């Protein structure tokens, strides 16, 4: 539920989705996951 | 007048086109009926060439009228672009002399560059 949708504006229908997750041992670091969504209600 | 002459010349132009196309078809059908083996009446065949030059004469009248009117209207536009009659002649000789001055300045210095 902690994500960020970055829409590209020069070409819409394209999103880069950043998902932030907690690294288990380090409590003061984050881990990022980058996805590439496309979209056509 | 030139607009009204133009309105005069348009239906004459359509008439000449109609007669030219129909007479072309008549002469071609007669010549094919002689060339292929066919009977055909000689009749009032009404030559093609006169219709063709008549159409060209109408187009000359049209282009003549339109070139005249276009020259007249462009003339009036630049005339408005540029009250005693001697004051008119004074500013007219002023304008002619000034344009002559610009032209001779350009010519003399474009020659002063080389040759």
């Amino acid at each position: 539920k902690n994500k960020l949708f970055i829409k590209l504006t020069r070409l819409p229908q394209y999103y880069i989705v950043v998902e932030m997750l907690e690294v288990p041992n380090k409590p003061t670091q984050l881990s990022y996951k980058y996805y590439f969504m496309s979209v056509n209600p | 007048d030139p607009v009204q002459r133009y309105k005069m010349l348009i239906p004459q132009l359509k008439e000449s086109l109609q007669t030219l196309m129909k007479v072309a078809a008549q002469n071609l059908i007669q010549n094919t009926n002689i060339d292929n083996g066919q009977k055909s009446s000689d009749g009032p065949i009404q030559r093609f060439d006169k219709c063709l030059e008549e159409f060209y004469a109408l187009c000359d009248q049209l282009e003549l009228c339109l070139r005249l009117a276009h020259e007249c209207l462009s003339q009036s536009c630049d005339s408005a672009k540029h009250l005693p009659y001697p004051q008119y002649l004074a500013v007219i000789k002023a304008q002619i002399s000034c344009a002559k001055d610009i032209h001779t300045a350009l010519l003399d210095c474009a020659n002063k560059v080389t040759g």
Binding site: - | H103, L106, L107, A110, V113, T114
Partner: protein, 99 residues
């Protein structure tokens, strides 16, 4: 031959439609004259830059001489600016003293 003279000839060719004794004729003539004019101008600049490059690789003391001259002009220009500013400051001190 001798790019100066082609520059002169093309520059005189830019004016050839005016000095003698509608729109599209003027447009194509202007475009062709101006394009050849700018092309020979760029070739002349290219020649001067190539000659400067050969001088800067062969005879580098001249470059250092020009740098010496430019830094000296920078010094004199800075001193002129500060002198004008200082005179204006002293005039404004004499103004603000009198209130």
């Amino acid at each position: 031959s001798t790019l100066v003279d082609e520059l002169e000839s093309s520059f005189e060719a830019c004016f050839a439609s005016l000095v003698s004794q509608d729109q599209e004729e003027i447009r194509t003539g202007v475009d062709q004259c101006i394009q050849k004019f700018l092309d020979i101008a760029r070739q002349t600049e290219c020649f001067f830059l190539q000659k400067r490059l050969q001088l800067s690789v062969q005879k580098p003391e001249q470059v250092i001489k020009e740098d010496v001259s430019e830094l000296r002009n920078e010094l004199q220009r800075k001193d002129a600016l500060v002198q004008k500013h200082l005179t204006k400051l002293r005039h404004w001190q004499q103004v603000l003293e009198d209130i």
